[model samples]
Target chain A: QVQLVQSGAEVKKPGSSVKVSCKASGGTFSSYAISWVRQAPGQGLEWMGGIIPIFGTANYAQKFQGRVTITADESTSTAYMELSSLRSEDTAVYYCARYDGIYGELDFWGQGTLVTVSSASTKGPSVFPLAPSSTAALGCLVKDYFPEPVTVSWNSGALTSGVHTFPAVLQSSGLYSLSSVVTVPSSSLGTQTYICNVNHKPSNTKVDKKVEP
Target chain B: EIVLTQSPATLSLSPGERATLSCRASQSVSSYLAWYQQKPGQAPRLLIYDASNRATGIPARFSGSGSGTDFTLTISSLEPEDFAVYYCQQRSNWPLTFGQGTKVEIKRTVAAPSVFIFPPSDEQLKSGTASVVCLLNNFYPREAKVQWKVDNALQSGNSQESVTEQDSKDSTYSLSSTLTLSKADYEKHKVYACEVTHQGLSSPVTKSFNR
Candidate 1:
């Protein structure tokens, strides 16, 4: 009689990565094995694989072998899994389950968590009128409200904000979506360069993009 | 991603009663099927699939037969070994789905619902793009099954399918299928779907495939 309740959403740029979690309730988390299932955006579900809670051993369907990882917290009755080095193809819903031999098979399974990956800027809300491209400049309309004003910096601070600019603005909701532009002079288009720092309350979360859009 | 259903919303069986379990699909699922027995502390065991064919090392008491969406998982005599819940799942899709499940007990009347029948092709399949399809016969609990049959013939390939309840746990259910063909099969034949059986209503339906 156990159940799994999952955490929230995350947005990552192409080539960047993210992690999500599923927490179990109603029974001892260590009594059975927990499995993870994946469903890419608009695609069918795929069995990522399963893990033994007691020993940390896992068996993934040959197909899902290197694409996923399983982790857990026995003391908190919670189990977690992470999908790395993200790509847009990785966007999808994920669920967790406990496989007990009896009770007819998989006794308990979690509902799902929706994860979306986009090339949009994470700094603010101003939309980029241009399609996703190396030269495309996005506006992150940063809203203001954090008692402690935050800062928005790129991955390599040394790379002068020379050609580009970031202007902080506040929306009606009192939140912030900073309006910033990333200038990719056609010359640096396909490079491996990235933009990283964005300070949100309590944490300065950095987001990235691989050369091309 | 097929959702399977068990008829008799509830089953009653006498200690020595005989029982029959039916798992019908919403569409034509080829014989990419497998049955499992869930007791309370054990993992499910693979039973039957490919229409009458048995999985290696499965017990003899369990038997399965049928083509398309209409299939049966029958238990001859009630033994302590035969009294747990049963489910039929498909190995034709990625994220698999399982039936709501039927629990068989001793000493009560084991209710059997109307038989589910399979329809012919849902659509005329093109070569190389079809795998298996299923039919949803009935669900006293109203569920749809994910099947793995190809034109009533069993399809053997690399695939997986399973089912679970709706997000709301309503009686209504759903199902799905997935398969990867080499550059070859993807251009070969067509796959078809059949209808599931429920009440003494109408004839089974079918769908044709080109994908």
Candidate 2:
């Protein structure tokens, strides 16, 4: 069993610094090394760096070499990363991943900590079910999202195997589109429907979608 | 959320024999565990949930037991169709996650896959951007990792989809992963390459398409 719970959301002004913490539980805290990955408002993952919690060795991506610090406390069973000089560009969801120190596969990941760098008033994204990307993939589309505050889930009474959630990438128009597709067999929907649920705090919305057979 | 780890990675067995599978939760999930069975190319079937209760239409042979951190999925008697894979998940926590999966193999041996890389068509590249796909043919054991490289340098976060499908006639698996890059990457020399790591292989198998 392995779980990495991270700190919650925080909004800070640019030039300010923020510290994100990931508390590890289940496995031996010292056995696994932790890596930090971030997704910009509308982009894919960027590997910031990693820390060997037990030995105190750390490494970073060239872009984040001096900008971020990754460290951990074995006694607290927690890993920590502090970023200095935050920019609006640093507004993203930072995730902590626990990988096998020996095998090197990122086997477990924290849910994510959103670090927002906006001083303006906040606005939530508009969300709805996009037409099924494929008869096999089903979920909703989210547009013009901010501060990465959204949870998407699609469930069927039957069974589905994979849950693919794309990072809400900023569209060229300056808004964002994020979606989570559940991989289901076309035939599995015999009597059940795919119910997509979205919960967003900023917008005060509990967005849900469904497609019946 | 809870982290569920399924044990034995692969369960080797013969059809009709009673099979037992283990799912260990990193934390106590009470009776909130669920088990799923999947044959290749088909959607997974929910066998048991709420720990020990059977889902609709699930056979009596497929039973779940235990609670808290140590739950079990038992197949009273494995059917030929039940020899694929079984996964366990826990809903006690938000953002529930799954196991790495336990494949019920037929007490196997490893067979390396033959690899192929397909490049985009000239018409596709004419647009200045396209994709290259790497196909892994006839691999055994169903578990593998993929990494893409541009002229031997490591690349990350490509499409990397595993469209895995098993050959029913032989039970071997084939899958393809796609990598998107620009004509700009081609000009970097050495073209595209996909490296595959499988438990069966002594080393990773790399297949490249050099334009």
Tell me, by TM-score, which candidate is best: 2
Off by over 4 Å in 1: A102-104, A122-213, B1-211
Native interface contact recovery, model 1: 0.03
* Residue-by-residue lDDT tens digits, candidate 2, A38-113: 7653333456778888899988866777889999999999999999998879987888977444322345678788
Q: Taking the tens digit of each residue's C-alpha lDDT, what string does model 1 give over B91-206?
A: 45434556667766444222222221121111212222222322121133433333344446644444333332221221222222233234355444455433333332354334
DockQ comparisons of all candidates to the true complex: 0.02, 0.03
Name the candidate that leads on lDDT: 2
In model 2, the runs with Cα more than 4 Å from the true position are A1-213, B1-14, B24-57, B67-69, B84-107, B145-163, B188-210
